[PDB]
Amino acid sequence: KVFGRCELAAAMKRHGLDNYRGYSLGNWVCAAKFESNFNTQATNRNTDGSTDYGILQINSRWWCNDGRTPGSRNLCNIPCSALLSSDITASVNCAKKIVSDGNGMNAWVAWRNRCKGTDVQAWIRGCRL
């Protein structure tokens, strides 16, 4: 599923991401925009052999199991395919664990390089929430 900007903002808010770990909703929408372009089905292979899945491009090296990432962890205890669903519950739940890991949202390369320090509030502007 390819979410609309405000549609995803509403979905993320409903699932409790607004100000989760101190990150306002705009940060999450911005991260999703540059990680997957709001597409829950997005997948991207990494040089190390792992793969990123879903709207927030969660990695198979530590968070989910895709059956082809040697010596990898499945900390979110889910198959990576669950992160591609039109229902973003799994992605949100796993993202909450990731952002609580210690480095906050810096865990997302796209957030650090394209959202951090910018006017992320712009990503939820004009949205009914």
52 an active-site residue? yes
Q: Extract the runs of DSSP E, i.e. beta strands, from 1-129.
A: 43-45, 51-53, 58-59
Report the sign of the C-alpha dihedral through residues 103, 56, 46, 62, in that order: positive
**Secondary structure (3-state) at 5:** helix
DSSP letters for 18-46: TTBTTB-HHHHHHHHHHHHTTBTT-EEE-
- Break the chain into its structural domains and give their ranges: 1-129
Q: What is the CATH number of domain 1-129?
A: 1.10.530.10
Selected catalytic residue, list 7, 18, 52, 66: 52
Tokens read off for 69: 């990432």
Residue 19: count of CB within 10 angstroms of its CB: 12
Binding site members for substrate: 101
Are residues 80 and 42 in contact, defined by beta-carbon separation less than 8 angstroms?
Answer: no
Selected catalytic residue, list 7, 18, 35, 66: 35
* Residue recorded with tokens 């992320």: 120
Cα 86 to Cα 82: distance, rounded to the nearest angstrom: 9
Q: State the resolution, in angstroms.
A: 1.6
35 an active-site residue? yes
